[PDB]
Design an enzyme around this catalytic site. Structure first.
Site, PDB file in Angstrom:
ATOM      1  N   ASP A 235      -6.755  27.353  13.227  1.00  0.00           N
ATOM      2  CA  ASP A 235      -6.463  28.403  14.211  1.00  0.00           C
ATOM      3  C   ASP A 235      -7.163  28.041  15.540  1.00  0.00           C
ATOM      4  O   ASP A 235      -6.994  26.916  16.005  1.00  0.00           O
ATOM      5  CB  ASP A 235      -6.848  29.776  13.646  1.00  0.00           C
ATOM      6  CG  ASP A 235      -6.446  30.909  14.548  1.00  0.00           C
ATOM      7  OD1 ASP A 235      -7.352  31.499  15.201  1.00  0.00           O
ATOM      8  OD2 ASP A 235      -5.228  31.203  14.606  1.00  0.00           O
TER       9      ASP A 235
ATOM     10  N   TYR B 196      -9.544  34.214  23.828  1.00  0.00           N
ATOM     11  CA  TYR B 196      -8.196  34.420  24.386  1.00  0.00           C
ATOM     12  C   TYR B 196      -8.124  34.658  25.907  1.00  0.00           C
ATOM     13  O   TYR B 196      -7.028  34.740  26.464  1.00  0.00           O
ATOM     14  CB  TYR B 196      -7.543  35.648  23.746  1.00  0.00           C
ATOM     15  CG  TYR B 196      -7.141  35.516  22.309  1.00  0.00           C
ATOM     16  CD1 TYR B 196      -5.876  35.065  21.971  1.00  0.00           C
ATOM     17  CD2 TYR B 196      -8.005  35.881  21.287  1.00  0.00           C
ATOM     18  CE1 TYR B 196      -5.487  34.962  20.651  1.00  0.00           C
ATOM     19  CE2 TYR B 196      -7.628  35.778  19.963  1.00  0.00           C
ATOM     20  CZ  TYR B 196      -6.364  35.324  19.649  1.00  0.00           C
ATOM     21  OH  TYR B 196      -5.974  35.218  18.334  1.00  0.00           O
TER      22      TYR B 196
ATOM     23  N   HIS C  80      -0.839  32.443   7.195  1.00  0.00           N
ATOM     24  CA  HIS C  80      -1.776  32.027   8.236  1.00  0.00           C
ATOM     25  C   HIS C  80      -3.173  31.660   7.719  1.00  0.00           C
ATOM     26  O   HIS C  80      -3.820  30.758   8.262  1.00  0.00           O
ATOM     27  CB  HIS C  80      -1.917  33.103   9.315  1.00  0.00           C
ATOM     28  CG  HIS C  80      -2.891  32.725  10.374  1.00  0.00           C
ATOM     29  ND1 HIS C  80      -2.625  31.738  11.295  1.00  0.00           N
ATOM     30  CD2 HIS C  80      -4.164  33.123  10.600  1.00  0.00           C
ATOM     31  CE1 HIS C  80      -3.682  31.570  12.069  1.00  0.00           C
ATOM     32  NE2 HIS C  80      -4.630  32.399  11.668  1.00  0.00           N
TER      33      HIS C  80
HETATM   34  O1  S74 Z   1       1.497  24.123  24.775  1.00  0.00           O
HETATM   35  C1  S74 Z   1       1.946  25.201  24.295  1.00  0.00           C
HETATM   36  O2  S74 Z   1       3.130  25.631  24.267  1.00  0.00           O
HETATM   37  C2  S74 Z   1       0.924  26.138  23.678  1.00  0.00           C
HETATM   38  C3  S74 Z   1       0.314  25.297  22.579  1.00  0.00           C
HETATM   39  C4  S74 Z   1      -0.538  26.158  21.707  1.00  0.00           C
HETATM   40  C5  S74 Z   1      -0.253  26.269  20.370  1.00  0.00           C
HETATM   41  C6  S74 Z   1      -1.037  27.057  19.558  1.00  0.00           C
HETATM   42  C7  S74 Z   1      -2.113  27.745  20.067  1.00  0.00           C
HETATM   43  O3  S74 Z   1      -2.819  28.512  19.133  1.00  0.00           O
HETATM   44  C8  S74 Z   1      -4.063  29.023  19.603  1.00  0.00           C
HETATM   45  C9  S74 Z   1      -3.887  30.316  20.366  1.00  0.00           C
HETATM   46  C10 S74 Z   1      -3.234  31.361  19.511  1.00  0.00           C
HETATM   47  N1  S74 Z   1      -4.017  31.642  18.336  1.00  0.00           N
HETATM   48  C11 S74 Z   1      -3.871  32.901  17.767  1.00  0.00           C
HETATM   49  O4  S74 Z   1      -3.572  33.870  18.449  1.00  0.00           O
HETATM   50  N2  S74 Z   1      -4.064  33.020  16.405  1.00  0.00           N
HETATM   51  C12 S74 Z   1      -3.788  34.244  15.732  1.00  0.00           C
HETATM   52  C13 S74 Z   1      -4.892  35.156  15.279  1.00  0.00           C
HETATM   53  C14 S74 Z   1      -4.751  36.619  15.311  1.00  0.00           C
HETATM   54  C15 S74 Z   1      -3.813  37.275  16.075  1.00  0.00           C
HETATM   55  C16 S74 Z   1      -3.722  38.650  16.068  1.00  0.00           C
HETATM   56  C17 S74 Z   1      -4.576  39.399  15.296  1.00  0.00           C
HETATM   57  C18 S74 Z   1      -5.521  38.761  14.529  1.00  0.00           C
HETATM   58  C19 S74 Z   1      -5.601  37.387  14.544  1.00  0.00           C
HETATM   59  C20 S74 Z   1      -4.121  34.345  14.281  1.00  0.00           C
HETATM   60  C21 S74 Z   1      -3.099  34.879  13.363  1.00  0.00           C
HETATM   61  C22 S74 Z   1      -1.820  34.367  13.363  1.00  0.00           C
HETATM   62  C23 S74 Z   1      -0.863  34.846  12.495  1.00  0.00           C
HETATM   63  C24 S74 Z   1      -1.166  35.855  11.611  1.00  0.00           C
HETATM   64  C25 S74 Z   1      -2.440  36.373  11.596  1.00  0.00           C
HETATM   65  C26 S74 Z   1      -3.390  35.882  12.462  1.00  0.00           C
HETATM   66  C27 S74 Z   1      -4.481  30.498  17.584  1.00  0.00           C
HETATM   67  C28 S74 Z   1      -4.927  29.298  18.392  1.00  0.00           C
HETATM   68  C29 S74 Z   1      -2.398  27.637  21.416  1.00  0.00           C
HETATM   69  C30 S74 Z   1      -1.614  26.845  22.226  1.00  0.00           C
END
Ligand code: S74
Ligand code: S74
Lengths: 316, 316
Positions: free
Chosen positions: A106, A237, A295
């Site tokens: 993640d 974030y 996830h």
């Molecule tokens: O170049 C491009 O196009 C972009 C490339 C790119 C690709 C990936 C990327 O991922 C990073 C940012 C988003 N991130 C999350 O938000 N994780 C969710 C958590 C969460 C979100 C919401 C609540 C709690 C926790 C997890 C989750 C996910 C699915 C289900 C449960 C939890 C993980 C790391 C960044 C950039």
């Protein structure tokens, strides 16, 4: 097959005046640094730590900055990738490690890719669970990318300081029981979080316990997040523009170290197809894929994760 | 090259409910556990830690039980060799280390010999600075040996709980400046301490600073001993009968693992000749000898100590 916190070796490294990183350490052999995601803990690697140690590795499982026993300063900029990466380099320096294998999941996955990208000399090999490495696009901002993909809408809800904190901190047990579930047990939409108002606006007030976790495991995360809450974690974030500008300084350099990308069939945010063209900028990339896995990969399919990681570690 | 405490990785292992051991950790490679003497600190190894890590070892420098950030329970029996050794084994267990090289000085040297005797499966190799290995004589009590060997008179003074503590804790700065000196800088004798009335009865009130140490180094020891004082450290001396009876149960068995004995020319208590017949019971023993070196071997001749230890570690 798991970890009892009071039976672990606990290490602490001060990486700058008021910032120290906590880790748990088990085993002898080459150093393997495990980096968890949001909103997790060193304890998310509980099934990997003994397996990797038994396989002949020295495992360092981090509380990432903002979490657990690691420092959690309030400032947003303390959690940009540039700062977090430099701190992990300092971590290795103070431990006297010229290199380590870095394995992330993640947000931890994002971090280890940037370690491999900008500090390859300190990264023996790199592995990511779920999180792809996509080279930065100089032309489109992160904000424009989130418009082009509405599955990342929730990220907008996390932007305003205090809003998401209030919801996530209100009832910690509910937060973690609602989040830590197999994909078929999901009680949350991440489609349109902002208009609804929050993550848990119409999910159960008293959610059941997922088949993945015990009450005791849930209460561990609850106790960890009472220390500093969700501000530090959510700050990960809140550095979209900074991270983008830093990543663009990569130019078009490749990752030439050994690399492993592990995809999870039922992760509906970090979907397997997001990783599909990674071998173009990572020539020595190997792959794993885990079916029926959501996830929370380490928790959902620990046996499969262990097999894949150990096979890969032993071969290169 | 030395160690700055705030730049070290600090590790903590709970070996039982009331007792946790603190250590500093530097380097990668085979595990080397360093065990200090009385009344010292992990910091007494400050010159060896970076040298050994640079030579390709993972150095664990202990605060022994009773010292520094390690637990210092009040009871005398918590510091008998049987208890101390069991705890060091638990330490290895919790870190997931099947074996370590053990290197000890003074009381730490005695400890590592006992580790090699009773826990050979957990000791890869053993080295002692100054402290010889002398098999237990079942026909003489320890009390009987001190009467025959008057140089150990000071040990009688250490028996009565509270007495040595009060003198040693009265002025910590004076205590450490008086003790930590080259042999040609000596300001006290261990000939007749009891009837004299104490260790510092007629030594300078404001002793000069030894060539071996800076003011900053002395003040680190001062700060460390402010936490728990001298009760725990002195309790290492107050288990003579227990240690003797325990040692007697090992009479027949031999140390077959690689072993190193380093003698110091000007240690007037732990004299080199005390070690003279060690190859009778350890035929494969290797030796180092340091000229012009007092009791505080690591501090006095760090370059020579580093050379001897690294040569030995790299060959056997
Ligand atoms: O170049 C491009 O196009 C972009 C490339 C790119 C690709 C990936 C990327 O991922 C990073 C940012 C988003 N991130 C999350 O938000 N994780 C969710 C958590 C969460 C979100 C919401 C609540 C709690 C926790 C997890 C989750 C996910 C699915 C289900 C449960 C939890 C993980 C790391 C960044 C950039
Ligand atoms: O079977 C047989 O003949 C007996 C075999 C046998 C052989 C050796 C042996 O050594 C152990 C007991 C004595 N011990 C000390 O008292 N260290 C002195 C500290 C001290 C004493 C007094 C004050 C402060 C510190 C150090 C010191 C020594 C010299 C100078 C300065 C400091 C170290 C370990 C035990 C048994």
């Amino acid at each position: 097959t798991s970890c009892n916190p009071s039976d672990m070796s606990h290490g602490y490294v001060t990486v700058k005046p008021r910032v120290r990183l906590h880790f748990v350490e088990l085993g002898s052999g080459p150093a393997v640094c495990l980096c968890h995601g949001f909103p997790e803990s060193w304890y998310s690697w509980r099934y990997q730590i003994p397996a990797l140690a038994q396989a002949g590795y020295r495992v360092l499982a981090m509380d990432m900055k903002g979490y657990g026993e690691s420092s959690a300063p309030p400032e947003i900029e303390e959690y940009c990738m540039e700062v977090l990466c430099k701190e992990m380099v300092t971590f290795l320096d103070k431990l006297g490690l010229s290199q380590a294998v870095f394995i992330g999941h993640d947000w931890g996955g994002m971090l280890v890719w940037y370690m491999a990208l900008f500090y390859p000399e300190r990264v023996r090999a790199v592995a990511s669970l779920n999180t792809p490495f996509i080279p930065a696009n100089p032309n489109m901002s992160p904000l424009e990318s989130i418009k082009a993909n509405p599955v990342f809408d929730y990220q907008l809800y996390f932007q305003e300081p205090g809003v998401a904190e209030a919801e996530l901190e209100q009832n910690l047990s509910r937060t973690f029981k609602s989040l830590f579930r197999a994909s078929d047990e999901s009680v949350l939409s991440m489609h349109k979080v902002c208009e609804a108002g929050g993550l848990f606006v119409n999910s159960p007030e008293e959610p059941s316990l997922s088949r993945m976790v015990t009450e005791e495991e849930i209460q561990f995360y609850v106790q960890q997040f009472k220390k500093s809450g969700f501000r530090g974690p959510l700050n990960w974030y809140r550095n979209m523009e900074r991270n983008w500008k830093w990543a663009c300084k990569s130019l078009g350099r490749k990752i030439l170290i050994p690399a492993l990308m592990v995809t999870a069939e039922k992760d509906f945010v970090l979907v397997p197809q997001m990783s599909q063209h990674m071998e173009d900028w990572i020539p020595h990339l190997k792959r794993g894929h885990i079916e029926d896995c959501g996830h929370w990969t380490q928790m959902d399919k620990p046996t499969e994760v262990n097999q894949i990681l150990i096979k890969w570690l032993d071969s290169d």
